[PDB]
C-alpha cells in the first residue's frame, strides 16, 4: 500500500493550494477514508478528512480546510485561505475500510509554501 502525492506545491497569491492523492488499491474498494494531516514544528495534527464511496463524490467533515473531487482511485484536494503561518507538510492518509481486507497508507506529504503580499 503506497500512496503518492506532489512533493511540493506553491499556493497562488490568492492563497489557493491544490494537490492530488492517488493510492494503490487491490480493486473495487467501496469505502475509503482520506485524511489530511499537517506536520508543523515537530507535531502532526489532522486538518481535514473525508469518506469516499465509489460511484459518487467525496463527503468531507464540517470545518475541513480541504475540499476535493474524486476520479477513480485519486482525489484532487484543494485548500483555500492560506498565509505564511499555514506553511507546512500536508500528509494525506488513505485507508480502505469496506470490503475487507483493510489496508492503510500514508504518503510522503505535499510541502505547501505560502507568502503574504
Amino acid at each position, epitope marked *: *500500500m*503506497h500512496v503518492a502525492q506532489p512533493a511540493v506545491v506553491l499556493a497562488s497569491s490568492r492563497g489557493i493550494a491544490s494537490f492530488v492523492c492517488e493510492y*494503490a488499491s*487491490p*480493486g473495487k474498494a467501496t469505502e475509503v477514508r482520506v485524511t489530511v494531516l499537517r506536520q508543523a514544528d515537530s507535531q502532526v495534527t489532522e486538518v481535514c478528512a473525508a469518506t469516499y464511496m465509489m460511484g459518487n463524490e467525496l463527503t468531507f467533515l464540517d470545518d475541513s480546510i480541504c475540499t476535493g473531487t474524486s476520479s477513480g482511485n485519486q482525489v484532487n484536494l484543494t485548500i483555500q485561505g492560506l498565509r505564511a503561518m499555514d506553511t507546512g507538510l500536508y500528509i494525506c492518509k488513505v*485507508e480502505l475500510m469496506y*470490503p*475487507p*481486507p*483493510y*489496508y*492503510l*497508507g*500514508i504518503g510522503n506529504g505535499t510541502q505547501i509554501y505560502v507568502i503574504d503580499p
Partner: antibody, heavy 124, light 108 residues
C-alpha cells in the same frame, strides 16, 4: 494460535465434498481464514477466504463450486466443494490470514498459522 | 488474475553455500508478497511477510529482497535442515495465487 482440519478421507465422485476447520485463538482479533489445497506432488492452490465480517467475496478457479461459511458458536469454518472429480484429490489446508504493520502502512497480509491438513481422495 | 512464476523448478547446492530463489509477478504488487517453506508431510511455514520482513520464529540466515514485480530469497550459509520446497505468494488481489515452487536439494 492453533487450528486443525477434519474431513473424510474418501468421497464418491460428483457429490459435494464437505470439510471443517476447528479453531482456537480466533475472534477478539481482526481475523481472516483462507482455504488452500495441494494435490499429490503438486504445488499449492489458493481457494478462498472468509473474514470476521462474514464476507466471502472473492474470485478463483474454484469460486464457482466452493461455499465457505462459519459456525461462530462451535468455532469452526466449513468449506464445501461441489461435483468433485479426480482432479480434486489433494491435501486441504485452512490457514489464518493476518495483516501486518510495516512502517507507516498496514496490510501486507500473509497466511500466518496453518493447520495439519486433511487428505481427501475422491474415488468410487 | 495476477499469476506468479518462480525459478528454477529445482536446484542443488552444498551446505554452507549461498542460494537464492526468484519469484516474478505479472502485475505490480507493491511488496505484498509472502514466502513459505514446506517439508513434505507437513503444512507450509511462513518465513517472510511483506516481501522483506521475516517472521519472528525464523532464523536470520533467511532474508528477502526485491520490489514491484521481481522478488528473491537468500540463504547466507545454508544448513542441511533447510531442505524443503519453497513457495512464493502474492496477497495483493482477489485470488492469492501461489507460485509453482522451487525444490531445494542439499547435495551432501
Amino acid at each position: 494460535v492453533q487450528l486443525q482440519e477434519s474431513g473424510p478421507g474418501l468421497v464418491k465422485p460428483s457429490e459435494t465434498l464437505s470439510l471443517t476447520c476447528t479453531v482456537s485463538g480466533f475472534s477478539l482479533t481482526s481475523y481472516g481464514l483462507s482455504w488452500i489445497r495441494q494435490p499429490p506432488g503438486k504445488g499449492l492452490e489458493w481457494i478462498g477466504y472468509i473474514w470476521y465480517d462474514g464476507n466471502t467475496n472473492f474470485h478463483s478457479p474454484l469460486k464457482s463450486r466452493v461455499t465457505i461459511s462459519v459456525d461462530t458458536s462451535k468455532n469452526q469454518f466449513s468449506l464445501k466443494l461441489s461435483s468433485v472429480t479426480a482432479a480434486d484429490t489433494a491435501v486441504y489446508y485452512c490457514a489464518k490470514t493476518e495483516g501486518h504493520y510495516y512502517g507507516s502502512n498496514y496490510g501486507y497480509y500473509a497466511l500466518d498459522y496453518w493447520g495439519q491438513g486433511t487428505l481427501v481422495t475422491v474415488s468410487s | 488474475d495476477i499469476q506468479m512464476t518462480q525459478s528454477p523448478s529445482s536446484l542443488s547446492a552444498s551446505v554452507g553455500d549461498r542460494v537464492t530463489i526468484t519469484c516474478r509477478a505479472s502485475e505490480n504488487i507493491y511488496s505484498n508478497l509472502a514466502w513459505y517453506q514446506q517439508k513434505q508431510g507437513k503444512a507450509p511455514k511462513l518465513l517472510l511477510y511483506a516481501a522483506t520482513n521475516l517472521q519472528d520464529g525464523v532464523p536470520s540466515r533467511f532474508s528477502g529482497s526485491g520490489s514491484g514485480t521481481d522478488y528473491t530469497l537468500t540463504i547466507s550459509s545454508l544448513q542441511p535442515e533447510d531442505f524443503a520446497t519453497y513457495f512464493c505468494q502474492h496477497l495483493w488481489g482477489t485470488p492469492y495465487t501461489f507460485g509453482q515452487g522451487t525444490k531445494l536439494e542439499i547435495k551432501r
